[PDB]
Write a protein that binds this ligand. Structure first.
Ligand SMILES: Nc1ncnc2c1ncn2[C@@H]1O[C@H](CSCC[C@H](N)C(=O)O)[C@@H](O)[C@H]1O
Ligand code: NA
Lengths: 265, 265
């Protein structure tokens, strides 16, 4: 009679909380999805071994179209868990799944876990200063989307930071690197020419947040565009004007050039 | 000879990640602060019991003025952990403490935990639609803070949601309720009269996120300003322009007036 939305956290199988683990262990059925994101620091096998339960993976369609025919029926006479990378309900369409549960007479509870939305605090950038967030999508065919560029513009204009999620093809396991995101943004700049993203723009790259050894690099596009940040997933941030304390952290921790202490403050 | 920043999570001791628990267990010394937030469902004893160590609790002054004199010296010869509610680097100034660590030749690692910043996802409001954040601070003497009012205005003009962290005076055991935040906001409106926060403004209250039954309520200020949302901590959110599914969730899950379903696109 109960459905548990449980977050898996950032990087590996140990990123789930103690509460999430113990609750999952007591569930009769455990489902998971890896289409909104993947756990690059672990495998399904390692997660299953840790939880001690067989885990049935669900595709995007399984969830978006048939959540009520696959997960909810079991939740009527059993304790069921639905695992997702990060913190539950962060992915835009997941909150609606709770309405589906209610509609079916099923109780649902949320067990939180670390999300990149909060984990980016490791970049030293004040989290109250982040503005609207966006996702950089690959152009294709006659389709060349650029809304994420306008997001950066509206945020930076008000001195706010822009968190940028990079395109991902979970099924094909293809990730968009920060390098690719930068090249794309430079391309969008040439078309819109709004003075939003150029070789002189300061950016921050966060990779493998949650791991014990994340990659945190900050610098100008002209110097980072071809730099190797390691294996995905990569997160890109376009800071607004910096707090001197933010800049100092970026210099001392993320290896940013001293130049930002005078140029971007 | 290392220093761990380890988040404890939202509500109780079980909100710590498995990674944080296992690392915290093997540390030689364990320090912690409980003034940046409130973990309503646990006690120091329960935390110590879970980690199996003696925890030395530090005050804001101990940290902000003497972190390098109390914590760092021990990190040079041992493995030290510094625990904090939620995520250690979110809406705190703890990030700067990593600079101090580095300058003392001490390596530091950050272990994230669920934060209120991402937990807002449980309100049904799209996480990427949040704009600049702010803190409703208690007036002191003749000093009446009001900047947070302007943040709401700026975000609202952009159709973005506003997350409002609520004040806390831990040494006086004072935790601002959403009710007090609303009262203070109406007073600021009377002063500025920008039509930003009135009896008719739709707001959302999230109380004790991290618990199994958090209080999630949405509605007009006039109706919620005196409602009892239970014990602290609370956060207040003034949504911007709503998507239909967001309104649907607020109505079905947060008990908002059915009339907000009719969004004025
Ligand atoms: N579980 C919870 N429920 C509701 N509000 C919470 C909360 N935890 C923190 N807050 C809010 O945030 C304020 C502390 S700000 C510090 C936040 C912390 N580092 C984190 O990552 O969550 C509180 O005064 C309160 O307004
Ligand atoms: Na945000």
């Amino acid at each position: 009679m109960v459905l548990y939305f449980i977050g898996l956290g950032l990087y590996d199988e140990r990123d789930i909380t103690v509460k999430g683990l113990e609750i999952a262990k007591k569930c009769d059925y455990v489902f998971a999805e890896f289409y909104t994101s993947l756990m690059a620091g672990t495998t399904l096998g390692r997660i299953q071994k840790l939880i001690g339960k067989e885990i049935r993976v669900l595709s995007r369609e399984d969830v978006e179209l048939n959540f009520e025919n696959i997960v909810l029926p079991l939740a009527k006479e059993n304790d069921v868990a639905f695992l997702t990378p990060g913190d539950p309900l962060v992915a835009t369409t997941h909150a609606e799944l709770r309405i589906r549960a209610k509609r079916a007479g099923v109780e649902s509870y949320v067990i939180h876990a670390p999300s990149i939305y909060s984990a980016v605090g490791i970049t030293g950038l004040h989290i109250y200063k982040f503005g609207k967030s966006a996702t950089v999508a690959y152009p294709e065919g006659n389709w060349f989307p650029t809304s994420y560029y306008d997001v950066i513009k509206e945020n930076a204009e008000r001195g706010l930071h822009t968190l940028l999620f990079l395109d991902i093809k979970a099924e094909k396991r293809m990730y968009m690197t920060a390098n690719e995101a930068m090249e794309l943004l430079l391309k969008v700049e040439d078309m819109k020419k709004g003075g939003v993203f150029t070789d002189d723009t300061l950016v921050v790259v966060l990779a493998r947040a949650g791991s014990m050894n994340p990659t945190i690099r900050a610098g100008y596009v002209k110097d980072l565009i071809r730099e190797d940040f390691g294996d995905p997933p990569h997160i890109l941030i376009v800071p607004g004007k910096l707090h001197i304390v933010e800049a100092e952290y970026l210099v001392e921790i993320a290896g940013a050039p001293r130049e930002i202490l005078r140029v971007n403050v």
